[PDB]
From Swiss-Prot, chains A, C, D, E, H:
GO cellular component entries: cytoplasm; proteasome core complex, alpha-subunit complex
Annotated metabolic or biological route of this protein: Protein degradation; proteasomal Pup-dependent pathway
Record text on activity regulation: The formation of the proteasomal ATPase ARC-20S proteasome complex, likely via the docking of the C-termini of ARC into the intersubunit pockets in the alpha-rings, may trigger opening of the gate for substrate entry. Interconversion between the open-gate and close-gate conformations leads to a dynamic regulation of the 20S proteasome proteolysis activity.
Keyword Transcription regulation: no
UniProt name for this protein: Proteasome subunit alpha
Compartmental location: Cytoplasm
Gene Ontology MF terms: threonine-type endopeptidase activity
UniProt source species: Mycobacterium tuberculosis (strain ATCC 25177 / H37Ra)
NCBIfam families for this protein: 20S_bact_alpha
Family that this chain belongs to: Belongs to the peptidase T1A family.
């Protein structure tokens, strides 16, 4: 039955998501913070999409790497066609939702990926950071506080919900994120920030000695 | 054809004449060359009348299409870029005689200081654009005379009324020195069209005010 | 047998539409009023199609967003081809019905959406507003008073039929719509109007302080 | 096996046609009269194909609307290619039959529609009106007196057979058609005529006060 | 099994031609005589293909009508390419055989038709008329005396075999054909002749007063 | 070739000559150049006769096709836009000698004032369109003489009969000053064709009225 | 080349010469330029002989193809339209050197009055068609002489034989004034071909009748 | 069921990989060392991809030979387009992961191959050699010390884990690799090195008398 | 137009004028021709203004696109290759008048010696590139005068300020001997733009420093 096929496909995608590392994206005073469990130093699950737009994912590496490349290609073309300030995270989230829905419906195997797109305000502007979560079937949700991806997200989400504090500093937010994600050392962590204080490009990786000092 | 545009403290004004000719023959006496593209932008196209109307319609359609799709209007840079792309795509037709020169006036609602939020953008034949910072610009066959008149009259611009009067006087000078630009027809009652853009949006100036200004200028030069 | 496949596709689409928020489009004196249960502030279920034509939908977001973009593209092309006053809501409803039927019959998964196209009169012209409902299979119907989409529509329809008043004011119509939809707060509501008194563009969103005061 | 699948497909089409409103087309002294039960005011089942050629249909609206558009496109192209008088109702009926047969055989879901193409004589010319009926599978039949479409057609067919009279006037023909269709009111009825007395375009709708007074 | 599918397809076609009207094509002194039982006056089962080549068919109307149009297109193109006298009935029979075989093997539903292509001699030339029967699967047979198509052809074939006489006049041939087909009035009869005495175009229809008087 | 169109209180009238020449040689003495496209529109096309007939037929088919498909005729702006698009599409062929100049007359049923519902639209070589507000327009080789005669005679227009007489006189003047325009033929009895559009629709003027008007004008100028 | 066509009460007649030349050299003395396309239509084609034969064959094939497919022949307007379409499609090749000008004669069986059912249609270089109402037409290099002769001689046409005689005399005049048109060759016994169309169809005139008519004309002019 | 197809496709690929010779790629002081069991002298499982990038594989020969050619074509094009020093082993590993995932998902039979890409530092530059292992389904992993491919990999992996020594010379590394691979002779072995001391091209084969002396 | 670049111990400096003309008529007084393509490379393009702006924007977009996709910026050679490909792709349009020559300045972070990490690259019309080893380069209509001035002034370059002064002096000389280059306008206060690249990145020189240097040069030459 077509309904049986759809349920089996959804079960396969959900099982793929569950057997994966966890990623947390949380808003803090300076912008958005991405913390991921990544033992690899070369393969990155956190990346920049555009000047004020960042990307995080959980699942099979090649699939969300392809989605990352497609999103970057879309964002650069859209920024060139009209202007850099015309690109927003909502457009990228919508494109990802449509693409993932098409993949889930039409492709032979569904994408076992769970995506988050984060946007911060421009320089010298005030605006609450926006977080959008996209699932395997193409569903889109707006998360106002934090996004948790991959693995068993119930304990992680509960810990984040209890420990969340608005307008927290970078060090405090990082400590909260690692403590919630534990339920790790300087290595086997990928940390990045969308910093609203930067002039043009907000994305910045925090690795090595600086991460060890903050952690 | 002649279209002038100039900034005044708190807004911008754009005016244009009414004559349309093919060679030495006068064929149109009430053409409208200034269109209100958006709530805060107005474009005037000089050159072939057909291409002017086509570009105005298509540019307005494109801006409204983007606004409807994305739920938010383009920034001023985006509008400038779309108009520049439209101009660049017409190079082949321009080399074949279907030339169109746009001049864009707008009000940057996202600008910090409302008193300096007016914007004037000029385009060349190669699609390049420049945001005029002298406060005035003109396009058309009589653009040189209009610009040289505004250069002397721009010290008198202090509000919307003074800007409108200076624009009308510049159009009068352009029509005076050029035979392809139509002056105020006191016989037929046909006067140049004008659009005023400020923080409240873009509005068409009523014909009565422009008629009064044109009559005052005419009796002053008598 | 193919008939089993057809009934299973219909059941899948009906289940998808039912597990969704409800939308109400009702005609009042000043035009048409759209009220939707939308917790999110960025995702919109109510949108403008053309100068006097508005659009509402219920179901999977990305599907009816795709249909929204297609309808906007059709309307702008048609208006450029002939004239702005040559675009009517009947044509958009017919195009939507045709494309929805084609998708239901041929696509891998049927679209789990239900659409409503509303049209008001032009400026300085009197005409009763038109409402068209299009379902997943392509069936198109004309509703003279109100359209209810998504969720359990029987109680909402019964409440509206009991409380509907022709030529009601905007405040009375909004009160009736909210009362029927409840069977919500200032937030988690999307309110829009096709206002027949506007010169060219009738669509207008009522949000924030205005929605708080009027409701 | 192909036989079982084809029988199930035919049964699906027949059940689709059965649960639909009835249409009657009958020849009278002035030409051809179409009477359909249509509660809607905008969605219309009776339309003009060409100067002296009219079209009636019963079934799913989108399908026969698509067929109507295709037939109009064919007729206009044929008239422009050779001449207006070289277009006949026989050619349109044959094109419809071939198209419907191809759709039934090759498409995923058969069209649950039934069509009638009617033709009258030209101005100042005497000729018996021609009525052609096309079914879902493409079978084409010539009905010399009347055509009944959709729903349970047996009672209406017998009522017309008993009540039909050749060369009847317009009022008498409308009374007979309404009486047979009942076995309705001014509303929820669509009435049209191919009038052989018109100079070029024979199609004319009878709605509103004229329909009320004549009936 | 592939053989099961082929046998089922053949049975479907055989039943398709079985429940259809019969056509008899027989050679007489003046050429070839086609006699069919056809109540309709607009739908024609007997037609001309080329100057001395005629066509008859029995089965589903739209299918053999499509075959008729294709054969006319082939014949006219071949005649224009080389000459009118280079087109023969054998070539048309062969192309029909190839087309029908391809349709039977490849198409979703086989054509439920049987065709007869007849040819007579040119003007001032003596040659026995040729008849070719083409079946649903593409089999082609050269019949020297008569061809019977559609329905239960056993009694008609036996009656013709007992009653056929070579060089019979047109009236006697029509009497024999009608007697064999009855095992009919002026109406519900379609009579045509490939008359070898005509200068260029041999096909001629015999309908109305001439058929009523001759029969 | 000359086709004139002029408004009168409550409607519009449009007339055209009958001569078609190939060089200096007369090839046709009874060509019809004014066509009734729809119930309330009439178009007349000057230039090559073949292209004129082709555009008339194609435009009528296009309007009827849209009306049959959508169940509602186009607004006057839509018809103008379709004609302008068709003119723009022929520009390449017009450069090759297949030139056609259309003039469109109509009666807007959706206009506010029915007495001023008449509409005259003129198209230039680039495909642009202009709704003439002076009340008269003309196309063809003799268009200038016809327009200059209408400029003087337009004060006399008060009703349909006066408008028809003025149109006939304008055509007579165009034929008088231009060799490619055929005047009223009193020998063969061939006279200009005319179409009158008012609230009741568009109707062809019978040749008897045009003949009497032409004879009266001829006797007046003798 | 010269092909004449003229109407007489109750039918039409079409006649053509026999000479085909390349440059100043005579290459053919017995060419047949008048074809019977259908039962009630005859077509002559002037210009290059190859293109003439090709168009005649293709037109006959097209008409018979439509008749076979739809079971009903085209109306006269349909045939005219198809011929005009082929003429228009040949314009690119006509400018290249393969020019072909057709002239169509027919008898409308659907005409109201049988005495006036004959129809003559002429096509110009741009593909436009015109139905002659003066009763005669001619195409070819010598068409002007033939038309100017028929203008004087058309008062004598009262039936089929008189019309045939007038057509033969017109061809004689065309051959007398133009060197590319062949006259009656008495030495070789080659005479113009003719086709007469009436209610009974289209029939070729036997060579003896045309020979007698040509001999009578020659003795008359001696 | 998608799950059923994927598990009978994964076990097919695993079984194909298992019945193959084992390859070891381990980092040593001078760069990277590839040691494979290859009796053939013409068919090679170890090859160069680019100046500092080498390739090793285990499985069906034609499949990873096709992958080798594709990787070489990608690397040369990338080096020509931008520069030789812009080509890294990470990009080649990513391309291999994309291609292998697509083949596994979409092709009729998945490739029964297991790839390893090795990269060393440039001349006069210090950097730890990088090893990437790509499996049949597109999964990509980073190995810091050694990679074992094909056959029963548990004994070789344990032996290398026990015996691996960082910064070991070429002789020590070769001896350890051969000893672990045994758990054979100079023949039936293929040995190659990515040598970091080479000026431009690092890949170098060690065969014949040189391999006899070194081993 | 003129754009100069020169290396100094520890970095590179690159300056450009502000004038843009259309023939002999000055149309722009504050054009910015020197862009910061990325944190360590600046690009200035001489020729048509529209093409220059388009190439600058596209080159910056391509560099940032590669950096975002691959996770590591291009090497200096890769950037040079992409710019050369971009130049070569414009040759067909360059022959049509859309000519543009770029000059690239950079600071190679991967170079062994920081004291000599500045790089100057010049491109020709055929897409060929050359890394200048004499320490200075110039492009534009007035490039010859700028290069000949820097050939004499380059012995004074010892740090960032000396290099900036030498660049401004070279631009002053180019404007002095060429009418297409705009000199320092003391009336409107418009001065050449500059970019300084060193180990800390690429930064725009504030207008006050350049104004001071230009005033000092003008007073020295008075």
């Amino acid at each position: 039955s077509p309904e049986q096929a759809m349920r089996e496909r959804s079960e396969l995608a959900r099982k793929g998501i569950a057997r994966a590392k966890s990623v947390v994206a949380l808003a803090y005073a300076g912008g958005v913070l991405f913390v991921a469990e990544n033992p690899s130093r070369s393969l990155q699950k956190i990346s920049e999409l555009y000047d004020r737009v960042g990307f995080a994912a959980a699942g099979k590496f090649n699939e969300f790497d392809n989605l990352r490349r497609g999103g970057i290609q879309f964002a650069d073309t859209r920024g060139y066609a009209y202007d850099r300030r015309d690109v927003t995270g909502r457009q990228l989230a919508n494109v990802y939702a449509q693409t993932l829905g098409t993949i889930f419906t039409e492709q032979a195997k569904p994408y076992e990926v769970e995506l988050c797109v984060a946007e911060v305000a421009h320089y010298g502007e005030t605006k609450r950071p926006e977080l959008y979560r996209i699932t395997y079937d193409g569903s889109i949700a707006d998360e106002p506080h934090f996004v948790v991806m991959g693995g068993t997200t119930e304990p992680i989400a509960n810990a984040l919900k209890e420990s969340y504090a608005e307008n927290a500093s970078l060090t405090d937010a990082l400590r909260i994120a690692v403590a919630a994600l534990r339920a790790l050392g300087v290595a086997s962590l990928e940390v990045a920030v969308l910093d609203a204080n930067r002039p043009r490009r907000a994305f910045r990786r925090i690795t090595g000695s600086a991460l060890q000092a903050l952690l | 054809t002649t279209i002038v545009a100039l900034k005044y403290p708190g807004g911008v004004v754009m005016a244009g004449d009414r004559r349309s000719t093919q060679g030495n023959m006068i064929s149109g006496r009430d053409v409208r060359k200034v269109y209100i593209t958006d709530d805060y932008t107005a474009t005037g196209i000089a050159g072939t009348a057909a291409v002017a109307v086509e570009f105005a319609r298509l540019y307005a359609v494109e801006l409204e299409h983007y606004e409807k799709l994305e739920g938010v209007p383009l920034t001023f840079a985006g509008k400038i870029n779309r108009l520049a792309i439209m101009v660049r795509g017409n190079l082949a037709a321009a080399m074949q005689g279907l030339l169109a020169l746009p001049l864009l006036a707008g009000y940057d609602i996202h600008a910090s200081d409302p008193q300096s939020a007016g914007r004037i953008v000029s385009f060349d034949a190669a699609g390049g654009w420049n945001i005029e910072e002298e406060g005035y610009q003109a396009v058309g066959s009589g653009s040189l005379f209009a610009k040289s008149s505004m250069k002397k009259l721009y010290s008198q611009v202090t509000d919307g009324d003074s800007g409108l009067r200076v624009a009308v006087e510049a159009l009068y000078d352009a029509a005076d020195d050029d035979s392809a630009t139509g002056g105020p027809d006191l016989v037929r009652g046909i006067f140049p069209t004008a659009v005023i853009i400020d923080a409240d949006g873009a509005v068409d100036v009523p014909e009565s005010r422009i008629a009064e200004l044109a009559r005052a200028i005419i009796e002053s030069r008598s």
